[PDB]
């Protein structure tokens, strides 16, 4: 019943005291955070409190969309020796700091995601050459489907790959994806290995990567410029915004204190120093 938008408990008036009750004392040893209120130690007047936690509820903490990647595509001239670059990005929040740290506060979570795609383009060669408005395709290849090979092979016939066709110069594109985990919650951390090295086998085939699980494998996104070759080369970038919605979490962990290094929890040398200098005696 107590919703997020409820007023915090009104602080009671309390006067002088000389009793055997000891509020003030604890023994953090138990592990219990001593639960005192202002009125417990000092004298308080009555106060009708109006502040509510409404803007810090799990929902609101993740309520902002966030950049997750920068995918590069381009459409060079047909005369060019280099091949028309189509980008393929594996879907993982771990590619950028920002969302990851916000997600790390929790061991597990269930969240239906909403993706937004802002696509910006530009010329490269200093030619007063033109280019007609381009049309992009963002194809979601789920784990195991054939990943595109050429900017123009069959794979793009999207028989079943849910795709999006975005014309440039229009409002950014957006799609909703429900919770797609193979579990009951997405694992932000996986302690263990996929393969158990067996006693009657080669170490090679018995070896995997620590903290690498399928739990967080979700296929790739394929992006290409649909318009064919154009005399004047035009590169473009596709920024992907992810905003977790209908979110819920489990088990708090301490926030990441030193610069992240790679997909694991691992850290690099030099970066292991977070706090600064300050004196024990200077306020």
């Amino acid at each position, epitope marked *: 019943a107590a919703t997020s938008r409820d007023a915090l408990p009104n602080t009671e008036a309390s006067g002088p005291t000389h009793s055997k009750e000891i509020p003030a004392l604890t023994a953090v040893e138990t592990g219990a955070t001593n639960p005192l209120v202002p009125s417990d130690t000092v004298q308080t007047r009555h106060v009708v409190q109006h502040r509510s936690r409404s803007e810090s509820s799990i929902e609101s903490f993740f309520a902002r969309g966030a950049c997750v990647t920068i995918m590069t595509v381009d459409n060079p001239a047909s005369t060019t020796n280099k091949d028309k670059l189509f980008a393929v990005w594996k879907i993982t929040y771990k590619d950028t700091v920002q969302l990851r740290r916000k997600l790390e506060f929790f061991t597990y979570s269930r969240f239906d995601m909403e993706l937004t795609f802002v696509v910006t383009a530009n010329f490269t060669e200093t030619n007063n050459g033109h280019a007609l408005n381009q049309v992009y395709q963002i194809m979601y290849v789920p784990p195991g489907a054939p990943v595109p090979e050429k900017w123009d092979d069959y794979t793009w016939q999207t028989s079943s790959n849910p795709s999006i066709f975005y014309t440039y110069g229009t409002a950014p594109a957006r799609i909703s994806v429900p919770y797609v985990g193979i579990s009951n919650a997405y694992s932000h951390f996986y302690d263990g290995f996929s*393969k158990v090295p067996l006693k009657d086998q080669s170490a090679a085939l018995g070896d*995997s990567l620590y903290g*690498a*699980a*399928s739990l967080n494998d979700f296929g790739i996104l394929a992006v290409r410029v649909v318009n064919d070759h154009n005399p004047t080369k035009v590169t473009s970038k596709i920024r992907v915004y992810l905003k977790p919605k209908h979110i819920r979490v489990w088990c708090p962990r301490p926030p990441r204190a030193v610069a992240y290094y790679g*997909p694991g929890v691992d850290y690099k040398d030099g970066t292991l120093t977070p706090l600064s200098t300050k004196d024990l005696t200077t306020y």
Partner: nanobody
Amino acid sequence: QVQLQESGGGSVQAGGSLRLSCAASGYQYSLLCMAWFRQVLGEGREGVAFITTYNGAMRYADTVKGRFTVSQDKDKNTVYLQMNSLKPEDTAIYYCAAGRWRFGDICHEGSGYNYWGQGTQVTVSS
């Protein structure tokens, strides 16, 4: 298709040290399992050392192990092969293959390798 632009052989004599560079053209990120090889003149086409793109873990061939070290240029998509202690028998047409990957499984020889390199030959004179 992934392209593996290799570089760059030569027939220096015993104990030598050269290196091979091979690009991801290609989309080096989580996929490719950049591996090394050398075709022992018609005998002959063995796998040298192989690196994992995702983590940077190397494994070598019982032959090359130690002298040869596989290096990785993550950001500029290149995988090197510091060919050390080049002895006469380090004469063979070198290779650079790169397959895909298993999400978490280490890049080994029994695993890859879908795509093929140029096959730039390094010979060790006697």
